[PDB]
Amino acid sequence: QESLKHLLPDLSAYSEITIHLLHQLVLACGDVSLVNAVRLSQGAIASARDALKAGCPVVTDVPVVAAALDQTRLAHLGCTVKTLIDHDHWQQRLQQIPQGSVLAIGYAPSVLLTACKLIEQQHIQPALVIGMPIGFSHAPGAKRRLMTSPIPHITIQGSLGGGLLAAVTLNALVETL
Amino acid sequence: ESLKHLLPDLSAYSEITIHLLHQLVLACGDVSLVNAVRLSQGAIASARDALKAGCPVVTDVPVVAAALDQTRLAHLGCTVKTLIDDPWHHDHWQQRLQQIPQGSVLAIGYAPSVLLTACKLIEQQHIQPALVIGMPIGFSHAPGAKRRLMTSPIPHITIQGSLGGGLLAAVTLNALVETLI
Q1: Closest to B167 (Cβ–Cβ): which among A1, A4, A27?
Q2: CATH architecture observed for domain A4-175
Q3: What whole-number distance in Å separates Cα of residue A75 and Cα of residue B105?
Q4: CB atoms closer than 10 angstroms to residue A42
Q5: Is the CB of A159 less than 8 angstroms away from the CB of B29?
Q6: Helix (H) or strand (E) holding A172
Q7: Dist. CA A53–CA A8, nearest whole Å
Q8: Which of A104, A137, B86, B127 could join A130 via S-S bond, C-beta 3.0 to 4.6 A?
Q9: Which CATH class, in words, describes the domain spanning B36-178?
């Protein structure tokens, strides 16, 4: 029996879109514990979907996140993709992010922490933050900080994260649209 | 925030091996992949020679094909096909697998059953791919299937002691293609 539905536990508390997202994440890296570890804010789904339908900017921290995105479907919706790290410092670019853009972070906790601090001071206002940095020593604290934020978000409790996972999360939302 | 600092010392490994491991950790964040990824002795060399020559690439399922860098692959002359289109018959996956071209690259990211059948056809000397990337999802038969791959004479890459599977199959092949170009 090679059925993903019957391998994973029952997820009947979550919506059909949420369930689809969790399935895609498991398919990406093989770790079934992901269904437990992923955290979504209350209406992350709707906030993401409203933004993508408006043809919002999509901004990634590093290029490998950008390269794993399905840019064909994003372009169809009218979304531009741009990267922070190729003064023209990455923080100068983050500070100019348009209201209602999607911010996807697959590598650096320092980028996630800087973004939370800008958000707290209301210097930027993304529609959604996908905060999935690699497990450097300051990654847990950055993700905790994101979970206190009023900005809609998707993140991961524990060590998992990365370029594929941040990209897969966004591809799953575009797929259901 | 440097990957080199986060991971153990990798100096005893080849430059291409280190690049591959970097890419897999960057993809899913699991540092244990450094020890869990197993490469057969002929694996890298056999994969590079086949890709240089523009070999056929075959995946078990479509999601794996979709995560490949098909631009770079098409630049080399490599075609990309799938065994299962919708995850006696005329065009079941078993028949497609039997007809796999000699010297092709086989990338399995989902189905243990496909890996089991592949290993059988190799023992019996009916097929001879250049490389088998065997990284199925952890269904009940997955442990058995990867055990048979570990003792196969075919050049191979697999995962043992981690939960790694799925699109890590594509990341693996993408990384080998990056070191050619």
Answers
A1: A27
A2: 3-Layer(aba) Sandwich (3.40)
A3: 32
A4: 8
A5: yes
A6: helix A163-175
A7: 31
A8: A104
A9: alpha beta
